[PDB]
Amino acid sequence: IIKKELGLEKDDKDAIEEKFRERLKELVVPKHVMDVVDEELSKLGLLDNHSSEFNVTRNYLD
Amino acid sequence: IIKKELGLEKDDKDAIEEKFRERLKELVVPKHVMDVVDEELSKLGLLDNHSSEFNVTRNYLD
């Protein structure tokens, strides 16, 4: 029932998370940077795009 | 309500607090620095996420 909640096709995710994950998929990525980027992405998803900190975090990710 | 039952749950309670609590739990650490970090955590929670001072406080706590 948690899953069965406002399907709406789940459109416009922007796959920025997945985009960066794939970009790093090919490279041999150390664990340290892995956890660092996981924390950064958790923060970013936990921030709205309007926030300037959101843009700063996205630049850090890039 | 996806935030409800974990999910994102951003801004419900400073996520850094419990993370650093468990990070410091194992360490044998002097008396005053507990109250120091408690003060820092109270400030961080009272500081908005977007504010640059909040990020500086998080960096100092790191």
3-state helix/strand/coil string of chain B: CCCCCCCCCCCCCCHHHHHHHHHHHCCCCCHHHHHHHHHHHHHHHHCCCCCHHHHHHHHHHC
Provide the phi-psi class of A5: left if phi over 0, else alpha when psi is between -120 and 50, else beta: beta
Amino acid at A2: I
**Residue of B10, B11, B57 to mutate, testing the A interface (most A Cβ within 10 Å of its Cβ):** B10
Q: Are B13 and B45 in contact (CB under 8 A)?
A: yes
Way it was determined: cryo-EM
**B29 within 8 A of B20, measured Cβ to Cβ:** no
Closest CA in chain A for residue B2: A2
Distance CA B25, CA B40 (A): 16
Give, as one character, the DSSP assignment of residue A27: S
Q: Does A1 touch chain B (CB under 8 A)?
A: no
Q: With beta carbons under 8 A apart, name residues in chain B contacting A5.
A: 2
Task: Judge whether B53 and A56 are in contact, CB under 8 Å.
Answer: no
- The torsion defined by the Cα of A58, B54, B37 and B16, in degrees rounded to 10, comes to -40
Report the alpha-carbon distance of residue B45 to residue A47 in Å, rounded. Answer: 15
